[PDB]
Write an enzyme that holds these catalytic residues in place. Structure first.
Site, PDB file in Angstrom:
ATOM      1  N   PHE A  77       0.834  -1.203   0.000  1.00 12.89           N
ATOM      2  CA  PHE A  77       0.000   0.000   0.000  1.00 12.89           C
ATOM      3  C   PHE A  77       0.865   1.247   0.000  1.00 12.89           C
ATOM      4  O   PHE A  77       1.839   1.332   0.746  1.00 12.89           O
ATOM      5  CB  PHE A  77      -0.858   0.048   1.264  1.00 12.89           C
ATOM      6  CG  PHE A  77      -1.827  -1.088   1.387  1.00 12.89           C
ATOM      7  CD1 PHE A  77      -1.639  -2.072   2.348  1.00 12.89           C
ATOM      8  CD2 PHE A  77      -2.925  -1.170   0.552  1.00 12.89           C
ATOM      9  CE1 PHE A  77      -2.535  -3.126   2.473  1.00 12.89           C
ATOM     10  CE2 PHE A  77      -3.824  -2.223   0.669  1.00 12.89           C
ATOM     11  CZ  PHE A  77      -3.623  -3.200   1.633  1.00 12.89           C
ATOM     12  N   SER A 113      10.044   1.152   1.538  1.00 10.08           N
ATOM     13  CA  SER A 113       9.026   0.311   2.174  1.00 10.08           C
ATOM     14  C   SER A 113       9.362  -0.036   3.624  1.00 10.08           C
ATOM     15  O   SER A 113      10.528  -0.039   4.015  1.00 10.08           O
ATOM     16  CB  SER A 113       8.871  -1.010   1.395  1.00 10.08           C
ATOM     17  OG  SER A 113       8.444  -0.809   0.062  1.00 10.08           O
ATOM     18  N   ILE A 124       2.144  -7.171   5.092  1.00 10.02           N
ATOM     19  CA  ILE A 124       1.773  -5.822   4.687  1.00 10.02           C
ATOM     20  C   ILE A 124       3.019  -4.969   4.486  1.00 10.02           C
ATOM     21  O   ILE A 124       3.877  -4.854   5.367  1.00 10.02           O
ATOM     22  CB  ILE A 124       0.812  -5.159   5.705  1.00 10.02           C
ATOM     23  CG1 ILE A 124      -0.383  -6.077   6.015  1.00 10.02           C
ATOM     24  CG2 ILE A 124       0.340  -3.807   5.191  1.00 10.02           C
ATOM     25  CD1 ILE A 124      -1.235  -6.456   4.792  1.00 10.02           C
ATOM     26  N   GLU A 125       3.118  -4.387   3.298  1.00 15.60           N
ATOM     27  CA  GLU A 125       4.229  -3.532   2.931  1.00 15.60           C
ATOM     28  C   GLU A 125       3.653  -2.139   2.742  1.00 15.60           C
ATOM     29  O   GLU A 125       2.787  -1.934   1.897  1.00 15.60           O
ATOM     30  CB  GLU A 125       4.846  -4.039   1.620  1.00 15.60           C
ATOM     31  CG  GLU A 125       6.073  -3.271   1.142  1.00 15.60           C
ATOM     32  CD  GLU A 125       6.573  -3.775  -0.200  1.00 15.60           C
ATOM     33  OE1 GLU A 125       5.948  -4.701  -0.766  1.00 15.60           O
ATOM     34  OE2 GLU A 125       7.587  -3.242  -0.693  1.00 15.60           O
ATOM     35  N   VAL A 126       4.105  -1.191   3.556  1.00 16.73           N
ATOM     36  CA  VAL A 126       3.663   0.189   3.432  1.00 16.73           C
ATOM     37  C   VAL A 126       4.800   0.999   2.837  1.00 16.73           C
ATOM     38  O   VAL A 126       5.944   0.905   3.296  1.00 16.73           O
ATOM     39  CB  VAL A 126       3.245   0.759   4.793  1.00 16.73           C
ATOM     40  CG1 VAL A 126       2.977   2.258   4.692  1.00 16.73           C
ATOM     41  CG2 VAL A 126       2.013   0.014   5.303  1.00 16.73           C
TER      42      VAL A 126
END
Lengths: 131, 129
Positions: A77, A113, A124-126
């Site tokens: 995201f 990231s 989950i990769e922000v």
């Protein structure tokens, strides 16, 4: 009128989770998403102009993935928040950041990231496009 | 601070065979297979992509429970849906259902469904009326 097949974008995806309330609380608190409901008790998480539909394990809706599996998703995201602020925020919710900030390749070029897991173990990769 | 996400950049599918998957998505959905990173492969569409992992190959980090055929995806096409469906059919793909009225992020959509080589559920849809 010959034509080429083309896809514009991803509208949504479905996650199958052990407990919908646990999941919605997490995504609202940690990623600031908007949990909504519609139709006959369908639940989704909204962000930007897309969403993630949630199915509870044992109460899945057809048609669905061939091999439904909790914790099988791996999602990246983009945030428009300064990444260091984003990391501080996530950690401040008691969430363990497993790596980051690290340079990665996004759809449109270089991104930075960080990573953590949701309550089902989904990765989950922000990320940010800010250089 | 109010934490916020703008959109999904990409996701990772773990597949039995990258070349098989790559050929499928290029032919059936018009995606572009590209190399990136350290010997990696992705499928480009619009301004997003799907990263591919081959089941059994070493990579970290990944989903807690990696599983082929565990994804359930809905894509928007700007191509007339009936034309898209006919095209997909001509690739030899079995259409499970469609066109049918469904729900998108931004309102009502019209969809058809099929599976990819690993059994992932693919929904191709339009907001066009």
């Amino acid at each position: 009128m010959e034509f080429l097949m083309k896809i514009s974008h991803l509208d949504h995806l479905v996650l199958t989770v052990a407990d919908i309330p646990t999941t919605t609380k997490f995504y609202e608190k940690v990623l600031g998403m908007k949990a909504v409901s519609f139709g006959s008790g369908r639940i989704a998480l909204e962000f930007g102009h897309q969403k993630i539909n949630l199915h509870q394990l044992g109460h899945e809706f057809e048609p669905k993935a061939q091999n439904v599996r909790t914790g099988s998703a791996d999602l990246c995201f983009i945030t428009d928040i300064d990444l260091s602020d984003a990391m501080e925020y996530v950690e401040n919710q008691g969430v363990v950041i497993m790596e980051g900030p690290v340079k990665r390749t996004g759809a449109q070029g270089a991104i930075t990231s960080f990573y953590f897991r949701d309550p089902d173990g989904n990765l989950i990769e922000v990320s940010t496009y800010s250089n």
